[PDB]
Amino acid sequence: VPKWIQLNNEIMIQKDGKFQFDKDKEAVHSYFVDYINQNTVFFHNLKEKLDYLVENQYYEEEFLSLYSFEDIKEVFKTAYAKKFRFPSFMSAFKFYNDYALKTNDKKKILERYEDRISIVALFFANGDTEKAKEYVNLMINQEYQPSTPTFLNAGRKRRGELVSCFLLEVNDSLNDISRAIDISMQLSKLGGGVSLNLSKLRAKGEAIKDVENATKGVVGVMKLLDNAFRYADQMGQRQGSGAAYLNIFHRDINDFLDTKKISADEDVRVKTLSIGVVIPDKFVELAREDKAAYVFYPHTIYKEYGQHMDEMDMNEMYDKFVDNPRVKKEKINPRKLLEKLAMLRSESGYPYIMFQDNVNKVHANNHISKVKFSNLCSEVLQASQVSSYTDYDEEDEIGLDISCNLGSLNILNVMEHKSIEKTVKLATDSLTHVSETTDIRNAPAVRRANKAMKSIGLGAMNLHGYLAQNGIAYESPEARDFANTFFMMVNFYSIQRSAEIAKEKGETFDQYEGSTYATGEYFDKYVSTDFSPKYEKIANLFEGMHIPTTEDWKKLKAFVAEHGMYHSYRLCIAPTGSISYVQSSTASVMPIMERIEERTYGNSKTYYPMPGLASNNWFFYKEAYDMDMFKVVDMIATIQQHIDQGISFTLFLKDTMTTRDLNRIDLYAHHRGIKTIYYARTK
Amino acid sequence: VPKWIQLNNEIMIQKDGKFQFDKDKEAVHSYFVDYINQNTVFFHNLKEKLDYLVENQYYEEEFLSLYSFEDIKEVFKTAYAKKFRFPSFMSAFKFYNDYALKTNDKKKILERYEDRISIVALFFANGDTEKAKEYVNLMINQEYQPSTPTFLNAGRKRRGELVSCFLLEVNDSLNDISRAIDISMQLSKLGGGVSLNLSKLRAKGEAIKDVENATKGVVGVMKLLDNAFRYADQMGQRQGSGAAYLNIFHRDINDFLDTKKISADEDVRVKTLSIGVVIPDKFVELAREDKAAYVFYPHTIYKEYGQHMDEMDMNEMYDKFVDNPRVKKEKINPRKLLEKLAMLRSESGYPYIMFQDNVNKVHANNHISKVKFSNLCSEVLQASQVSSYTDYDEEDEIGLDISCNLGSLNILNVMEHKSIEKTVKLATDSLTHVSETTDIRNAPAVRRANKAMKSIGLGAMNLHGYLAQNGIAYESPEARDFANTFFMMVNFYSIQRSAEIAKEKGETFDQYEGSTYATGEYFDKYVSTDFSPKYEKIANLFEGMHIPTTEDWKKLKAFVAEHGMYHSYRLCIAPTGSISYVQSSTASVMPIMERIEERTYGNSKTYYPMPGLASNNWFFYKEAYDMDMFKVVDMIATIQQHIDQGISFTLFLKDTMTTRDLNRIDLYAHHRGIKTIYYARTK
Amino acid sequence: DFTQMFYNQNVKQFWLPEEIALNGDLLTWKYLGKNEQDTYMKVLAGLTLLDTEQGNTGMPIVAEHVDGHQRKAVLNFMAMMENAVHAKSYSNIFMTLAPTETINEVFEWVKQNKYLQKKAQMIVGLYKAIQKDDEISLFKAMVASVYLESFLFYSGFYYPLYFYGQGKLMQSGEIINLILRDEAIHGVYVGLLAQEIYNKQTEEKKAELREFAIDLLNQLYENELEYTEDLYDQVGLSHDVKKFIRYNANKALMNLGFDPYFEEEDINPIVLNGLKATVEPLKDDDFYF
Amino acid sequence: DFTQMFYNQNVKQFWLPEEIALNGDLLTWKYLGKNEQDTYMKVLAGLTLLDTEQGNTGMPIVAEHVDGHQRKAVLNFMAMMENAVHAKSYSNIFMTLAPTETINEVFEWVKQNKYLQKKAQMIVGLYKAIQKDDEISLFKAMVASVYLESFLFYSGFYYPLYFYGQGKLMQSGEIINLILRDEAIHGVYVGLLAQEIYNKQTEEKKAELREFAIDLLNQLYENELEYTEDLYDQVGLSHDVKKFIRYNANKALMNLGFDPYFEEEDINPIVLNGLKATVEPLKDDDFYF
Numbered sequence A, B: 001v002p003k004w005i006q007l008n009n010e011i012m013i014q015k016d017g018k019f020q021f022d023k024d025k026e027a028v029h030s031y032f033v034d035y036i037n038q039n040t041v042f043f044h045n046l047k048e049k050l051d052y053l054v055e056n057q058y059y060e061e062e063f064l065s066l067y068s069f070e071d072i073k074e075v076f077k078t079a080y081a082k083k084f085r086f087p088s089f090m091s092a093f094k095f096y097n098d099y100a101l102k103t104n105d106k107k108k109i110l111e112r113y114e115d116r117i118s119i120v121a122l123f124f125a126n127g128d129t130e131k132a133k134e135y136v137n138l139m140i141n142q143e144y145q146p147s148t149p150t151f152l153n154a155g156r157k158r159r160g161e162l163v164s165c166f167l168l169e170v171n172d173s174l175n176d177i178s179r180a181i182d183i184s185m186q187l188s189k190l191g192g193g194v195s196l197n198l199s200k201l202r203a204k205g206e207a208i209k210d211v212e213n214a215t216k217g218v219v220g221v222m223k224l225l226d227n228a229f230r231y232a233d234q235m236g237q238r239q240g241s242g243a244a245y246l247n248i249f250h251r252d253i254n255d256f257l258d259t260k261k262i263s264a265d266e267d268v269r270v271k272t273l274s275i276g277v278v279i280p281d282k283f284v285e286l287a288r289e290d291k292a293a294y295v296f297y298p299h300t301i302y303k304e305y306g307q308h309m310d311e312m313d314m315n316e317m318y319d320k321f322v323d324n325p326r327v328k329k330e331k332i333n334p335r336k337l338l339e340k341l342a343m344l345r346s347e348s349g350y351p352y353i354m355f356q357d358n359v360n361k362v363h364a365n366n367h368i369s370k371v372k373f374s375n376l377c378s379e380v381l382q383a384s385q386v387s388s389y390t391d392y393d394e395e396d397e398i399g400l401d402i403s404c405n406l407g408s409l410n411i412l413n414v415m416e417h418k419s420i421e422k423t424v425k426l427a428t429d430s431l432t433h434v435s436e437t438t439d440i441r442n443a444p445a446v447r448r449a450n451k452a453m454k455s456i457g458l459g460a461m462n463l464h465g466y467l468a469q470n471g472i473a474y475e476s477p478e479a480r481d482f483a484n485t486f487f488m489m490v491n492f493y494s495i496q497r498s499a500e501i502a503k504e505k506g507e508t509f510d511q512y513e514g515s516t517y518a519t520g521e522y523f524d525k526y527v528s529t530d531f532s533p534k535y536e537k538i539a540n541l542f543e544g545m546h547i548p549t550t551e552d553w554k555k556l557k558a559f560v561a562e563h564g565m566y567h568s569y570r571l572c573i574a575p576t577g578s579i580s581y582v583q584s585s586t587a588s589v590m591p592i593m594e595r596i597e598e599r600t601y602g603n604s605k606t607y608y609p610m611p612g613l614a615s616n617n618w619f620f621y622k623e624a625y626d627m628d629m630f631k632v633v634d635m636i637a638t639i640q641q642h643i644d645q646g647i648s649f650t651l652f653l654k655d656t657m658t659t660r661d662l663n664r665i666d667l668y669a670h671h672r673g674i675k676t677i678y679y680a681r682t683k
Numbered sequence C, D: 001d002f003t004q005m006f007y008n009q010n011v012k013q014f015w016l017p018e019e020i021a022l023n024g025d026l027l028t029w030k031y032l033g034k035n036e037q038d039t040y041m042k043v044l045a046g047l048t049l050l051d052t053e054q055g056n057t058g059m060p061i062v063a064e065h066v067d068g069h070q071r072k073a074v075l076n077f078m079a080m081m082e083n084a085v086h087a088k089s090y091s092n093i094f095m096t097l098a099p100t101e102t103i104n105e106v107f108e109w110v111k112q113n114k115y116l117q118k119k120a121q122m123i124v125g126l127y128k129a130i131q132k133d134d135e136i137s138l139f140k141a142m143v144a145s146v147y148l149e150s151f152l153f154y155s156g157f158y159y160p161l162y163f164y165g166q167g168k169l170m171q172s173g174e175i176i177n178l179i180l181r182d183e184a185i186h187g188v189y190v191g192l193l194a195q196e197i198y199n200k201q202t203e204e205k206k207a208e209l210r211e212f213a214i215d216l217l218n219q220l221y222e223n224e225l226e227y228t229e230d231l232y233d234q235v236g237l238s239h240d241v242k243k244f245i246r247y248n249a250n251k252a253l254m255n256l257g258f259d260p261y262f263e264e265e266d267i268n269p270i271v272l273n274g275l276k277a278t279v280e281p282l283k284d285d286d287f288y289f
């Protein structure tokens, strides 16, 4: 057992009835005195290091060639002047095991934290030394964290794509299904998580070229996609991850759900394909009134109306579908379907729940399309247009496939530096740069939507960490007040930066003129409701920072009207799995699952306390499972009212609560305006 | 139970110790006087029938519009003038259950045998009334039988494709793999059996752009193809059938074979994809000498030499592969691999065995490409060039994917009518028409190969029926002499018709100038060796027909040199599974499995005696399992010497014999020049 | 050819009542109508009473007369499951859903019920008629046993499976599914032992044993139809239950190596949702001809 | 007052030999002398015979005659353990350590060994003499069963325990300890049932039953002495084993409620060292907040 691992395991050993949290710090020192410095490759000067990394195909020549060597050296010096120290052993371990650049033999460390941050900053700035230094100060203060793809791969020649969330629309044809399989394989090859909408696909027992009972339904397509994702597994590094979304009014919805049951046969169950269910308000109304619902055959609806079932508003179309004899449908019990969803989420955490009307009643780009499905993490909610992939030697009709750009603000570090505006604007600029530098040659609709929509996702993390280190309970009304104010400022500065980029470049996102930003509707609740903190403690937390008022929001609305907005979407709160360790932050805006988490690496045990955990804030670091899920829903809705896309919202349940409690949480989330529900993790 | 069912079951009720074969005839009468005539749909005249079939989307109106109604009436009258009667109940039952056109609800019979034959003939003639009458006389006499796709689907609006088998070359890339999956689904949707050569795909543990041990090998692609064929299953009517072919020198050859082991795990086992193994002469030489062999990693060979492992001759490059340190290889025991092949064929009948050198030592189009794999029935052996399917928005390099049209000569009916020449020429014309009117819009390499190669497959059926009905034992040297003479005549007249078509159209198949037809090498054994019958009985059997001599072959060689050949490939002997029932013929050139076969249909059981089975020829209808497989190999080699493509050669084994006997049969087949071995069916 | 394989499958299916918590069934039980609760109670008591006969007599009597140490061990294991596991499981379900007085009354009713008694006594009669060293009488008892395991239980299993397939009474439905899975393998195993005896007989004796089996099946089937209407008409399910009885009768016949008696029928989808050749090395000179 | 706690103890002790990997004994077995291996094989074969008859005959027959479904469930479970678990475990040991010919030979040896045949004849004879509703014949068979459980096994158990205590053949020894743990509770349980019957008798009848028990014990004891000498003389342990069987004879008597018969002796200290989630329906009030 290594010395740092012993020093880390000494945390659980209680002295005077208290955990030895400070010992973790010592572990970090050991982890750097015994391992990191010994296995870190050192060079006589930075010029030699850069030459070795470029020549050995570690870095890219293009992004480094935009700067003189003096500017690169100045950026590296700015990164190293902070003298950044990892506060916990797990932060440094996760960085140097997951993100630090290693030799081809994986035994030496080529990149420190400062080196990786400097390289990512130089990639972000695209030739501006001052902008690169600003990015270096942003990331070394740990105010902003690029996502795992961006942070890991920026500036590296041997790399995947910087985007890892991809949403694909699948049209109801064999050509479109095969193209979807191909694109899923290509994007999993790039290292991205792929979500596919299967609602347009006709159900099982439908007609193919006017022969009856011929379609295999969406379950056969799910089997094909599951095989494709198993095959494309990042060159045998990570398990291929894919998601499939189906509307709850699709007839296959039960069989869809049956793919996640344990009792399902081998020809029914898909193991590497996550599933999500899109639930329109009509289904919730039918379940609430206990009226029996109807699941429709999509191809009959398409033949009758010329549009797909998921392309029209089910609230106004459901009665017409039911009363139409030419539309084929099957009787179901919506309450039984809700109970089945709750039971499946209890067993396996699936499916993801998308409340379609909750997403689309605040969607700014409904003119382009309504949000029909979400991503693999159930937080990307954007307009998508299906593509018509025709036969060979025939021109395809390329639509819009969602691929947003991830990046997370560290709420604790951002707010302690009183730099919400600067961090949000710099993160928006970096996300815009990464979106502009993304070029996928095997996903035509993804590339077209990246060029047109210019959608980015700016998330936040360390919400619970910040609240606990400031003596605020996550379920307290003060925490929701802080979340409201902080995320309203984040939205304000994100919109301001998007409008500034649109003014500078002279271009907005495609079909912006029809958006609620152009019409000013988006700013309605912002020009009438003041989002300043209602509690003195939160106001003192925001001291030293200008909180945008209704007049500021009116000025921003006028600015957007005059200049437009560069990004169709700006904010989405991703789970932030492993980057939260490196940043010493709690994951996403979720409450912490455990105060101290026990992990097993190799044959060794390691202990990670939550950041800033001590005896004084032990009570404020309440575990997520012990919390009331209604108050967690309230906080997530408070944040969601300022996020244009969704939030990865995992439910944290105890083994005691039943499926009725899960359904109640889901229905309260639907009532409170929650757009997506990610997971049902049972303790 | 139906009256005809009782009459057919009365065959096995012996009277005076003999089977009541004549009862079978009675059954047909019943089957027509109680079911077919009552279930048939009669019109006032042919005009009303044709109009009803045209407007109700049963028939394509284009092929019928090329004839005036008087000509169509004359063709139908020619078909009905023969007064064709089905001699066995099973012939009529199979036609009216599998090939006769029925209504949309399948409650009535719209097409008689004469109606189907007339429609197929009118489609074949393409506006020529005299040619349509010739086709009608050829098919109503049952001298020639179009394949099941062509016979069933010719002239139908709801038809599929007329091509039975498709062969795809899969290049070593994710884009090519995805395109192969798409094309396999498209062609299975069209109803054709798809064969894919996986020998170019790099083995398991190869590098995908400098990251090693990343590839899943051919087994992952096999699983993808298996799921694709499961999904595309002819709209749920016929199970999707696919074939995978791998060279025996591929490193994955064991894992390949492990896909068919009955103890294989679900993550490896493949159940809807047939497997074939391509064995060069080098492997047989290594096994014979008991020298340990080496299987190779295709990607290392491609990197070192710039060509795929199956793209070059292993007999001359195996030592270079072994001595090359930059080529990666694994040690295997070739005798152990042969024993594994024999055990697998005993257990499940797989893999198909393709003796590559036996195919390519007489292959006439080696300049275009060597034959690297076979079809799903292991009788199509043609040159194929792999396609380079590139990224989206990039032009693809379209290669040649094999596809040929099947058609079988009924040997008994052809020789009874003394019309080898006329039947062969008319069948060649019909297959040329089927190739010309075939246009597949989702398989580009298949379309290009169909347009360029113009390859057709003219098979033969009722070899054993003709031999047994003429008092010739199938294993006798007289039977092999008859096969030699008959198939030399078939080859002569097929080459003559191909050259005549090339002369009349002024065009040959692509790259004909480099073929052995152009250089005259193909005719060598035909201009030096006489293939006239060596036995007086066979010569009497061939009386009334001009058997080509060496002078006729020299004249044909000169004619080909002057005019060329329209078809790259002309003769391939398919299994002819279910259409042999309608023709009252034994399946293909294979010996009969059983004298009387008991088949269960619905809740009833039926007995089909072999065509012409009686007391005097009971022992001439020797069952295949009771026959010496070495003499069957001799027969198949004798036929194969006159067939440019392969023959679907099924091995018929007894349970008592061991895997050593199967290996001996395989090695004798390789020694005798057998190109492919189809199945190892054990009694 | 089969006893060690069945030994393995039996012992790996071992389970105990305590593993399934039953109390959460009260959350759906309270929402059923009186007729539904009545039918469930009566069906449950029917299964309990029949399974007790199998534990006290059916399995032990067959174990006694069958020769072979390994067969006796498998049969002992099956008898153990009846008495130690199944019987306790049925009792647990009852005690959870009904008060003591209600349980006593239901058992009094089902104990007096004409259709339950007819089948229970028919089966027990054949077990009591086994004679030492007489394989014909043993075979007849094995047929009776297979009919109980693979056929007679299923008019009863229908209802718990029907609820289980709807999301109702899931804990007791899980228990019933485990019990049913044991009875299925019991029926298959005893069926193979019966076929062994059958195959030792002359052709005339075989035809006579077939007539016995079909005649017995007919008597039991006609009583099952009456039993079914008596219990299921009040909840409107009898038509579908009858299809399920015939489908399971066919399985019982197949267990005894006999042809199916009834035409194939589809089953209620809710209930459905509830439910080497000798290797010889190449010796060389096989490559030369 | 006791059956329920025995039921719970028996079912919680459930095990299968496959839970214990035996390849670890391969070397300590290889290292034993031919005499030691011979005695070991024969000892376990004698145990196998006893468990075969206890499972096939003894426990099922006692189960048949004892009243009460719970008492029958315990006895049925014990019967299953005898032949489905205990007797089979010995074959697992044999198949690991010995070649097939040695296994075949030892099973042939049990058939022809006069002491093993005599003890089986005596014990099984008493089992088969039980008469329905005759409590005295039942008592006699229960005494025989206690003597098998708590006395007769021990001439066999000595040797695996003797090795286990020296750190030899410890995987096989683990199996044997599990078997011994079972037999100890089986002997107590059957002993309590025997005492029930004995306590119903007149003083005169009791005096006769004690005579029966002591005469039977002495007869079995004298035979076991000869068996012990026959097996253990070649390994030098006969006198030590004899002390062990006398010790256990006293335990058998005590299980029957009788005073110890043999004087206490020091036993070899080596041998002493050898010892889904819950589902509720959705209410209409769960849709409003």
Ligand SMILES: Nc1ncnc2c1ncn2[C@@H]1O[C@H](COP(=O)(O)OP(=O)(O)OP(=O)(O)O)[C@@H](O)[C@H]1O
Residues within 6 Å of the ligand: A028, A029, A032, A033, A037, A084, A085, A086, A087, A092
């Ligand atoms: N907690 C930590 N986080 C990150 N790096 C660390 C940490 N502890 C030590 N190191 C690394 O090890 C070096 C030694 O640091 P130490 O605590 O011994 O003193 P120092 O004054 O920071 O040293 P130096 O002269 O290297 O700057 C640091 O410069 C840094 O590179």
Ligand SMILES: Nc1ncnc2c1ncn2[C@@H]1O[C@H](COP(=O)(O)OP(=O)(O)OP(=O)(O)O)[C@@H](O)[C@H]1O
Residues within 6 Å of the ligand: B028, B029, B032, B033, B037, B084, B085, B086, B087, B092
């Ligand atoms: N074996 C058969 N094959 C094909 N069609 C048959 C067969 N048997 C009967 N039919 C059909 O059923 C009709 C019944 O007539 P059948 O053969 O009994 O003799 P028919 O009335 O004297 O006239 P004909 O033989 O001249 O048609 C036939 O005309 C024919 O259309």
Ligand SMILES: Cc1cn([C@H]2C[C@H](O)[C@@H](COP(=O)(O)OP(=O)(O)OP(=O)(O)O)O2)c(=O)[nH]c1=O
Residues within 6 Å of the ligand: A189, A231, A232, A233, A234, A235, A236, B171, B172, B173, B174, B175, B177, B201, B202, B207, B208, B209, B210, B214, B215, B216, B217, B220
């Ligand atoms: C992407 C991917 C490829 N492969 C295998 C199958 C293909 O035959 C083979 C080639 O993939 P390619 O698509 O050719 O990958 P590449 O072109 O980026 O890499 P290279 O330059 O080396 O050609 O890699 C996998 O096994 N799994 C995968 O996920």
Ligand SMILES: [Mg+2]
Residues within 6 Å of the ligand: A172, A173, A174
């Ligand atoms: Mg379409």
Ligand SMILES: [Mg+2]
Residues within 6 Å of the ligand: B172, B173, B174
């Ligand atoms: Mg490549």
Ligand SMILES: [Mn+2]
Residues within 6 Å of the ligand: C051, C054, C081, C082, C086, C179, C183
């Ligand atoms: Mn039972």
Ligand SMILES: [Mn+2]
Residues within 6 Å of the ligand: C054, C082, C149, C182, C183, C186
């Ligand atoms: Mn049972």
Ligand SMILES: [Mn+2]
Residues within 6 Å of the ligand: D051, D054, D081, D082, D086, D087, D179, D182, D183
């Ligand atoms: Mn025992």
Ligand SMILES: [Mn+2]
Residues within 6 Å of the ligand: D054, D078, D082, D149, D182, D183, D186, D187
């Ligand atoms: Mn015991």
